[PDB]
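FAQ
Q: What does a multi-component entry look like?
A: The components come first, one per line:
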Amino acid sequence: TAPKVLFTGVVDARGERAVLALGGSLAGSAAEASHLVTDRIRRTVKFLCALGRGIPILSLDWLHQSRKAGFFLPPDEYVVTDPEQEKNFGFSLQDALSRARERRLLEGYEIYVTPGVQPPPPQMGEIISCCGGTYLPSMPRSYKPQRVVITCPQDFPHCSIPLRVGLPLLSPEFLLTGVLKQEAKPEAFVLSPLE
Amino acid sequence: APKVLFTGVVDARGERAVLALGGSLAGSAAEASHLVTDRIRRTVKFLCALGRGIPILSLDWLHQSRKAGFFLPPDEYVVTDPEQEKNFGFSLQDALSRARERRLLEGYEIYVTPGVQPPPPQMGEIISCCGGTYLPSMPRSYKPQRVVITCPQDFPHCSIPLRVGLPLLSPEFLLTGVLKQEAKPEAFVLSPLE
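Then the predicted structure of the entire assembly, as tokens:
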């Protein structure tokens, strides 16, 4: 199966051209990609979706060396190594990828994101889906385990129904930090709607 | 303040007018308050905008807004494309009206099997913009309006939805349905044993 490669961080004509010349294609999104090529660990839709799916996240050297070979090389030795952001964000990329490959982080979760949330709900929905969760199109009316509402102060006036039925009201960082680290921990991210 | 999505042509003047008049540029149709375009097209951007019922307007909206000095009401600037309204058999104004009443896929739950074209994540964006739920994996149980969009490559994986009576549908159920704002699964049922 020919790689569908996504680029992010660097506008890299030589790399893109090498993908095509080697018989691969360029990916339109991280959700479609087989491989992500990048320089650093970043909290972006592209990086978080790639990580949530557990696809290879590789340096530009993969294509540099593949171009010399004349064919796509095995990905293993080209994994992104960013000790600085690993320290600063408190996770190991290899370990996070290993977790994602065993089971996607949000399997079993149903998540509604209220309209005023930042980052924008549709971007949050893309990340939720790439982590195997269900992005809900409207506010729930009933309780279910692992059904949660990502919300914000602007939207507290609209939260009486989820409060009524005991659905957790969570910070958007539940998703962003959780997906980055591949660890879901709703409790520290519970909002205070009356304050 | 409007968040305006452009699609079709790079319209630098139009983009500046948006910024000057107190708006911003939208990153996607799912985020936009307004879509500016020349023609009716079957694209993720156009279909998402239509599913959401947002104004879909010509380049003249911003041209006249810039001349007037403020964002004009959208009503007079709706895209008029009689040719594509023919290629596709629908009225854009009527479709927008339908979308504003109720989103097309309210109550639907849709799984798209991995081999489908256009790609599942794009189908998922459209499903969500039409008020449906895009499912992350194959269902195991029957529910009304729970359907599976699939394809010949994926027929070998369809025993469970067949077992429980979930419809197996063509991707055009979505694409044609959203374009027209009419959801009619029957014509789109696939034949998995052939």
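Q: Is there any commentary attached?
A: Sometimes. For this entry: Chain B touches chain A through 20 residues (CB under 8 Å).
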